[PDB]
Symmetry: C2
Subunit: 159 residues, 2 copies
C-alpha cells in the first residue's frame, strides 16, 4: 500500500520532522482512533533524531513521549479547520505519532503540527518521562513547543 | 560514560533485556528519583529490539512505553528485598528505564525485573500507546508480562 508524503521534512531542535498519510488504520486499544470506515486518511508525524541531537538521542532514533496536535485546513475553501491530537503507536515500519482523520473532499490542504516536549504542561506523558541533568550523563534542556506547516494535494484512494 | 554490567543480556520476545548500573543520577523533573546523596547506584533496564521483532520495532530500537518493576535481594540476607518501579528517561547515551537505589552494602545480589507490555492494565503508560492491527501495517500482539533475573556482586561505588 501507498504512503503519501506531505511536503518535505523540516529539521528543528536536533530532530527531523516529517508528515505522511496513508489509508485509515485499525488500532488496539479500540475506540480511540476514529473508525477507519468513518475516516479518509491516517495522518502521521515521523520524528527522528538528527546527528548531535541535544537531548541525548542517537541519530535515527524515534523521539518518544512527545505530544502532537494537528490542524488541517482545506486551502482557501469552505469548511472549518480539522483539529485533533495525535497518539503514539507502533506499526510494521516502527513507532509513529498518528490519527485517523475525516477530510472535506479532494483538493489542497494545509497541515500544521504543534509539537510539545515531554515536560510541557499540555503533554500528558510529562509525569512518566525524565531527562538526566547531572554533569556526567546529563543532556541539554528540552526544546520549547513549536509548530511546523506543509501543504499537500488530497485526491482520495485513486492510487 | 562508565557503566557496570549485571550478568549478561537475555533475549526474550524479540527483545534484548540487559541490566546495568552506574553512579546515582540527577533528573528533570526533580523530586522523583531518590536523592543521589541518599543512593548507592542508578540501576537500569536496557531494552532494545532484536532482528524480526514481532511488534514492528527495527533492530536496535529502544522499546518504549514499558513499565518495569524490580526486586533486588542480598544473598544472605538479613535485610528486606529492595523494590521499586523504574522510570523511562533520556541520558547522553540515549533513553533507558532506570531508578536511583540504596543497596545494603557490598556483596552478592539477585536482581529480578518484571516487564509489563504497553497494553497491561498495571502499566500507567498503556493509555498513551497503540498498536496498528490492520492487515497492511499491523503487528503481532504485545508480549505477556514476564520476569528476568540475574546475579551480580556489588563492591561500590
Ligand atoms: Na502534494
Ligand atoms: Na523540575
Ligand atoms: Ni500510525
Amino acid at each position: 500500500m501507498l504512503e503519501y508524503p506531505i511536503g518535505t521534512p523540516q529539521n528543528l531542535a536536533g530532530m527531523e520532522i516529517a508528515a505522511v498519510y496513508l489509508q485509515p488504520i485499525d488500532m488496539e486499544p479500540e475506540g480511540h482512533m476514529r473508525k477507519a470506515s468513518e475516516s479518509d486518511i491516517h495522518i502521521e508525524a515521523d520524528i527522528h533524531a538528527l546527528s548531535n541531537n541535544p537531548n541525548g538521542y542517537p541519530e535515527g532514533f524515534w523521539v518518544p513521549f512527545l505530544f502532537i496536535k494537528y490542524e488541517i485546513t482545506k486551502v482557501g475553501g469552505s469548511g472549518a479547520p480539522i483539529t485533533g491530537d495525535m497518539m503514539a503507536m507502533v506499526a510494521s515500519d516502527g513507532p509513529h505519532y498518528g490519527d485517523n482523520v475525516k477530510l472535506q473532499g479532494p483538493g489542497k490542504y494545509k497541515v500544521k503540527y504543534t509539537i510539545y516536549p515531554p515536560n510541557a504542561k499540555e503533554n500528558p506523558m510529562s509525569p512518566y518521562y525524565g531527562r538526566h541533568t547531572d554533569r556526567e550523563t546529563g543532556v541539554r534542556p528540552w526544546f520549547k513547543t513549536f509548530s511546523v506547516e506543509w501543504d499537500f494535494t488530497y485526491a482520495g484512494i485513486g492510487k
